[PDB]
RNA sequence: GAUUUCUCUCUGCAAGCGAAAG
RNA sequence: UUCGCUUGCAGAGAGAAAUCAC
């Protein structure tokens with residue numbers, strides 16, 4: 001385990017080197033002088049680390065988090081990688097161990113917070129000769145110092161736990177100065193000074209029972225509930241020992257911790273210690289199959305599965321009631337299909353799907369998560385996921401145990417990752433077996449989700465009818481085998497509102513699963529000896545059709561938008577002019593295309609109310625006017641509302657307003673018309689807004705049948721034509737209609753309407769509401 | 780227990796890119 | 802304007818790890 005974060009390293013040298021995050025830019029965005037707008041792009045970071053002497057700085061970084069490491073990275077490479085490089089000399093681990101123990105049985109330590117303190121303190125309360133003796137297993141387990149050292153002296157400790165006990169004893173013998181090995185554990189040589197212990201008893205901060213499990217090594221034997229009792233006068237281990245038949249707790253062994261996700265409590269497996277490492281007839285005991293699986297360590301003889309231990313600033317014992325069904329849960333919790341079931345809270349109801357749709361059609365824990373959780377509990381390294389332009393590898397201690405690669409490259413980081421993670425999970429699921437006839441009592445598409453309410457009961461095939469798994473609401477992906485098959489086939493017939501039921505004479509649920517779900521296990525065990533059937537009762541609550549991925553497509557050969565620009569460009573060259581206005585210049589596409597070709601225009605102007613849009617445009621104009629601007633001499637962009645008059649724009653010859661009107665109110669459309677024609681006097685004006693009747697063709701793949709979630713309205717060819725001509729006549733303009741898209745002949749009409757207002761006739765004050773956000777004039 | 784590191788998910792927000800019935 | 806993709810920031814929630822005055 002080398003996760004050596006430069007950061008933690010600094011914690012070893014006190015909170016003396018302060019970090020400061022500073023935000024700087026990397027010129028990764030277009031440089032545009034003069035713009036009064038601000039495109040707040042991602043800023044990169046670099047960290048400041050003030051260590052006593054000198055201070056170090058990280059160079060540019062994308063992640064605030066990476067930089068802080070980077071500062072610690074440059075702080076330690078300048079020192080000589082002095083803290084990371086330090087590792088243990090084998091014999092030096094014995095010194096740590098030795099010196100550590102010595103400190104533990106020292107006077108002062110007796111009143112320490114560290115779990116040991118309660119253990120050591122508790123050891124004084126042990127009856128008879130057992131007094132003052134802490135059991136070996138505790139000196140090795142509770143304290144990680146001993147473990148970190150023990151691991152270095154021997155990795156074989158992980159597989160064989162009795163080894164840490166022998167190293168503990170041997171270190172105790174070499175340092176016999178205040179440590180005496182007793183048939184009852186380790187004990188101090190001399191009495192704790194009377195005052196220290198009295199001082200201790202004054203401040204103590206004061207018959208409980210903790211149900212656990214009893215695991216036999218004899219396969220035939222049943223695993224049963226064995227409730228152990230803890231008393232303030234006896235170390236909890238003696239209580240466990242007492243149940244395994246032994247005489248001391250000094251005999252008790254302790255496995256690593258496990259099963260938090262499976263059972264919900266931190267567990268240990270207490271078994272006995274072959275008298276060989278203790279004295280440090282001779283008939284070793286039978287290996288305990290079950291016990292060994294659960295904890296991933298080899299254990300002998302019977303064992304006790306329990307969740308007990310001392311916490312920190314407390315003398316109080318912490319525990320949880322492990323029960324018979326906690327045990328079965330822990331097993332099912334080892335397979336991936338099982339982990340999924342437990343994570344989903346419906347073991348008999350769910351199943352680990354075989355395929356991945358979209359992260360919106362899935363249900364329960366992601367293949368990736370349930371995978372990583374799987375490896376860590378399995379004594380393995382986080383799975384390495386390879387993305388190419390998917391390939392997932394499994395690593396455990398430098399050894400490769402699984403390598404996978406999926407053929408389809410879904411268009412998403414997560415999705416390709418999740419699909420590979422399922423294949424992997426299916427494989428491991430093949431190592432432990434999991435995944436009959438039916439009778440019934442009272443059209444759905446793959447890629448849909450059903451919300452059922454199901455109820456399961458175990459009873460004798462006809463005090464015998466007992467509920468096992470109930471559930472009010474759960475959603476299931478349909479067609480990915482994400483639920484028990486019988487319930488799936490049953491449901492795909494049902495329609496919303498129905499309650500169907502059926503039973504399995506031969507229970508389809510592997511008993512380990514039935515036992516994992518059911519609380520009164522004693523009654524469940526009985527029913528399983530006689531003909532037991534499993535009753536399913538489903539009520540359908542809702543459904544949701546197939547997924548929606550196919551979202552966008554190109555319909556018109558040249559894309560609609562460009563034809564619209566082209567069309568308006570034709571009018572600009574056909575009638576030659578000077579000044580042009582762009583009421584609603586999005587990001588400058590009209591102006592983009594317009595400055596790509598030598599056009600007899602003199603000065604351009606864009607007006608828009610969108611700051612995010614005016615920014616993209618000014619940058620484009622900056623680059624476009626740099627190539628030889630064939631004819632322009634004063635480009636300008638105003639952040640303003642076209643529904644407003646600004647004296648700065650006068651003498652407009654050509655006037656563009658490409659489909660903006662439809663983006664505002666129907667009166668705002670009229671008011672805009674009114675002002676543009678009357679106040680600005682454009683010699684020519686081009687307005688576009690799509691023909692509404694066309695939307696019926698595009699649907700084939702405020703109002704119904706609308707294009708944007710922004711359009712306030714949409715017009716028919718007759719609606720537009722009317723508004724258009726009313727405004728025209730009332731202001732002396734010549735109006736002609738045409739569109740882009742299809743053609744004026746084919747009945748649908750044009751896909752987008754266009755009205756060309758022409759001044760036939762060919763009262764002002766100053767007010768500058770707008771705000772010049774960008775300007776430019778050849779000098 | 781103090782502290783701290785690293786992850787993943789959720790929602791919020793910003794930006795870059797691409798496209799379109801804008 | 803609108804949608805989709807990618808990345809950075811904040812907050813919340815779950816999870817793993819490590820050190821702690823001899």
Ligand SMILES: Nc1ncnc2c1ncn2[C@@H]1O[C@H](CSCC[C@H](N)C(=O)O)[C@@H](O)[C@H]1O
Nearest residue numbers: 584586587589608609610641642658660802
């Ligand atoms: N009242 C108003 N004043 C000015 N601009 C407006 C406005 N209401 C909407 N707009 C602008 O109208 C634009 C509509 S979409 C832009 C289409 C443009 N013809 C192109 O093809 O690039 C948006 O950029 C929006 O900011």
Ligand SMILES: [Mg+2]
Nearest residue numbers: 659662663801
């Ligand atoms: Mg529009």
